[PDB]
């Protein structure tokens, strides 16, 4: 075989395997499947208007901190300017949180089940945090469609990293460098799927995963809209956390 | 725009 023909044969390079290893570890170190810290949040109240906002605000604020910790471990991420790291996290946080949550989501009853009845969230809980079907229905649909992909954890953490390092985010300065970082991750994912995800599950899997990124942009836009409306009321904004205000807007 | 807490968590 010619060097060309042989070079066309897909192979997970040592560097690409290394990238996957780092992202798996990063996820391990920032997602607690025991959910032990939820005790620390303001208590969930299920009955009054916005009764679940304090608890879900605390959950989300906690999860933003975890997203930041994961982002810092993405190969290339820290070579970005402080400003670009900030804009990428401000814009992606809600999306990565939606991705992370797929781990607790269950299609048994279409809820996020975090180990106990107190920490099991359904569409009614989300509405009681100030959100409407315009966000919630598509969010459930997203969770269902993602679950249907039955991603390998490898693919799950690659997707989160690709989500974070997106060059077309608002406020991005060195889009060229963000794009180079993302491309290394995207190629790693494409090659992982070809070499490690057996058919039929692999069918158009990359394209399906990129469609989920597009879905996340739409969810982000609608969340931002409802969040601005929600936070416009000072009495609501009072119930949020300082980190949520800084990241999602004030 | 100043994101002190984000900036500090990123250090
Ligand atoms: C967080 C995590 C979890 C679930 C995520 C959920 C379920 C409840 C509703 C949430 C929090 C959605 C809400 C639209 C976000 C509301 C935020 C705000 C009130 C500030 O506008 C986004 C993700 C959803 C649980 C666990 O998987 C850890 C993960 O890390």
PDB file of N, CA, C and O in Angstrom, chain A residues 5 7 9 23 25 38 51 81 91 107 136 144 171 179 191 198-199 238:
ATOM      1  N   UNK A   5      -2.579   5.776   0.563  1.00  0.00           N
ATOM      2  CA  UNK A   5      -3.671   4.854   0.852  1.00  0.00           C
ATOM      3  C   UNK A   5      -3.667   4.486   2.333  1.00  0.00           C
ATOM      4  O   UNK A   5      -4.705   4.521   2.994  1.00  0.00           O
ATOM      5  N   UNK A   7      -2.373   6.180   4.764  1.00  0.00           N
ATOM      6  CA  UNK A   7      -2.626   7.365   5.584  1.00  0.00           C
ATOM      7  C   UNK A   7      -4.118   7.662   5.670  1.00  0.00           C
ATOM      8  O   UNK A   7      -4.566   8.390   6.559  1.00  0.00           O
ATOM      9  N   UNK A   9      -6.374   5.419   6.119  1.00  0.00           N
ATOM     10  CA  UNK A   9      -6.950   4.505   7.099  1.00  0.00           C
ATOM     11  C   UNK A   9      -7.056   5.217   8.446  1.00  0.00           C
ATOM     12  O   UNK A   9      -6.051   5.644   9.010  1.00  0.00           O
ATOM     13  N   UNK A  23      -9.925  14.371  29.331  1.00  0.00           N
ATOM     14  CA  UNK A  23     -11.303  14.838  29.448  1.00  0.00           C
ATOM     15  C   UNK A  23     -12.132  13.904  30.335  1.00  0.00           C
ATOM     16  O   UNK A  23     -12.980  14.363  31.097  1.00  0.00           O
ATOM     17  N   UNK A  25     -10.899  12.160  32.863  1.00  0.00           N
ATOM     18  CA  UNK A  25     -10.455  12.472  34.208  1.00  0.00           C
ATOM     19  C   UNK A  25     -11.084  13.778  34.688  1.00  0.00           C
ATOM     20  O   UNK A  25     -11.563  13.868  35.818  1.00  0.00           O
ATOM     21  N   UNK A  38     -25.690  18.364  47.459  1.00  0.00           N
ATOM     22  CA  UNK A  38     -27.017  18.967  47.312  1.00  0.00           C
ATOM     23  C   UNK A  38     -27.643  19.326  48.657  1.00  0.00           C
ATOM     24  O   UNK A  38     -28.523  20.183  48.733  1.00  0.00           O
ATOM     25  N   UNK A  51     -41.255  28.727  44.000  1.00  0.00           N
ATOM     26  CA  UNK A  51     -40.882  27.988  45.197  1.00  0.00           C
ATOM     27  C   UNK A  51     -39.615  27.153  45.003  1.00  0.00           C
ATOM     28  O   UNK A  51     -38.925  26.837  45.971  1.00  0.00           O
ATOM     29  N   UNK A  81      -6.679  33.813  25.989  1.00  0.00           N
ATOM     30  CA  UNK A  81      -6.594  34.967  26.877  1.00  0.00           C
ATOM     31  C   UNK A  81      -7.642  34.816  27.966  1.00  0.00           C
ATOM     32  O   UNK A  81      -8.640  34.111  27.789  1.00  0.00           O
ATOM     33  N   UNK A  91     -20.944  32.037  27.875  1.00  0.00           N
ATOM     34  CA  UNK A  91     -21.869  31.681  26.811  1.00  0.00           C
ATOM     35  C   UNK A  91     -22.230  30.196  26.838  1.00  0.00           C
ATOM     36  O   UNK A  91     -23.335  29.819  26.464  1.00  0.00           O
ATOM     37  N   UNK A 107     -35.392   8.391  31.289  1.00  0.00           N
ATOM     38  CA  UNK A 107     -36.568   8.295  30.438  1.00  0.00           C
ATOM     39  C   UNK A 107     -37.656   7.429  31.055  1.00  0.00           C
ATOM     40  O   UNK A 107     -38.706   7.223  30.449  1.00  0.00           O
ATOM     41  N   UNK A 136     -38.957  24.462  28.586  1.00  0.00           N
ATOM     42  CA  UNK A 136     -38.965  23.160  29.238  1.00  0.00           C
ATOM     43  C   UNK A 136     -39.253  22.007  28.278  1.00  0.00           C
ATOM     44  O   UNK A 136     -38.583  20.975  28.339  1.00  0.00           O
ATOM     45  N   UNK A 144     -34.126  13.619  25.938  1.00  0.00           N
ATOM     46  CA  UNK A 144     -34.542  12.361  25.323  1.00  0.00           C
ATOM     47  C   UNK A 144     -33.707  12.013  24.096  1.00  0.00           C
ATOM     48  O   UNK A 144     -33.229  10.892  23.962  1.00  0.00           O
ATOM     49  N   UNK A 171     -18.502  37.746  21.663  1.00  0.00           N
ATOM     50  CA  UNK A 171     -17.454  38.356  22.455  1.00  0.00           C
ATOM     51  C   UNK A 171     -16.088  37.741  22.226  1.00  0.00           C
ATOM     52  O   UNK A 171     -15.093  38.245  22.740  1.00  0.00           O
ATOM     53  N   UNK A 179     -10.877  28.239  17.303  1.00  0.00           N
ATOM     54  CA  UNK A 179     -11.244  27.299  16.256  1.00  0.00           C
ATOM     55  C   UNK A 179     -10.218  26.182  16.128  1.00  0.00           C
ATOM     56  O   UNK A 179     -10.573  25.030  15.884  1.00  0.00           O
ATOM     57  N   UNK A 191     -12.738  10.641  14.832  1.00  0.00           N
ATOM     58  CA  UNK A 191     -11.905   9.455  14.730  1.00  0.00           C
ATOM     59  C   UNK A 191     -12.285   8.442  15.808  1.00  0.00           C
ATOM     60  O   UNK A 191     -12.232   7.235  15.572  1.00  0.00           O
ATOM     61  N   UNK A 198     -18.988   0.947  17.491  1.00  0.00           N
ATOM     62  CA  UNK A 198     -19.450  -0.033  16.504  1.00  0.00           C
ATOM     63  C   UNK A 198     -20.820   0.259  15.909  1.00  0.00           C
ATOM     64  O   UNK A 198     -21.688   0.832  16.567  1.00  0.00           O
ATOM     65  N   UNK A 199     -21.027  -0.118  14.640  1.00  0.00           N
ATOM     66  CA  UNK A 199     -22.333   0.123  14.020  1.00  0.00           C
ATOM     67  C   UNK A 199     -23.336  -0.820  14.695  1.00  0.00           C
ATOM     68  O   UNK A 199     -22.936  -1.828  15.287  1.00  0.00           O
ATOM     69  N   UNK A 238     -33.005  38.708  43.620  1.00  0.00           N
ATOM     70  CA  UNK A 238     -32.589  38.534  45.011  1.00  0.00           C
ATOM     71  C   UNK A 238     -32.407  37.069  45.389  1.00  0.00           C
ATOM     72  O   UNK A 238     -31.637  36.745  46.295  1.00  0.00           O
TER      73      UNK A 238
END
